[PDB]
Amino acid sequence: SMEQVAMELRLTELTRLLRSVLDQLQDKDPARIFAQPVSLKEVPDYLDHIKHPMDFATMRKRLEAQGYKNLHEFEEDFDLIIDNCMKYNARDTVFYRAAVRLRDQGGVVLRQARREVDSIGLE
Numbered sequence: 001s002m003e004q005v006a007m008e009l010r011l012t013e014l015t016r017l018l019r020s021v022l023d024q025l026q027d028k029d030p031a032r033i034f035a036q037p038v039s040l041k042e043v044p045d046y047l048d049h050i051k052h053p054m055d056f057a058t059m060r061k062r063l064e065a066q067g068y069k070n071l072h073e074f075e076e077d078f079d080l081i082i083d084n085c086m087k088y089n090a091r092d093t094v095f096y097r098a099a100v101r102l103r104d105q106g107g108v109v110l111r112q113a114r115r116e117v118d119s120i121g122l123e
């Protein structure tokens with residue numbers, strides 16, 4: 001149907017915008033601390049602490065499969081990256097502090113992204 005194609009175009013456009021957002025957020029992690037999943041080989045107790053791991057590579061996989069239906073779902077995953085890190089690591093660590101900086105700087109990006117998603121009407 002034509003309506004289905006139109007919806008898929010909207011999702012494709014949302015995916016394009018989120019790809020831009022993802023690139024901007026990842027730039028606020030210059031250390032690449034959040035680039036990949038935490039290694040369960042190197043950190044074997046991680047899943048005892050963190051029930052829903054997340055990282056930028058995993059987000060990118062879901063994004064390219066057009067697996068984010070709206071901005072809220074995307075933000076949920078970004079918040080997992082930050083929140084997981086701030087629980088597993090103590091305040092006085094390079095990991096926790098990287099998460100705080102990513103949260104603070106990323107908030108600016110996500111604030112305007114919400115306006116753009118609403119404005120263009122991608123949901």
Ligand SMILES: CN1C(=O)CCc2cc(N)ccc21
Pocket residue numbers: 033034038039043084085088089095
């Ligand atoms: C994000 N993160 C942690 O939360 C602590 C465990 C860890 C190890 C390595 N190698 C990179 C990142 C992390």
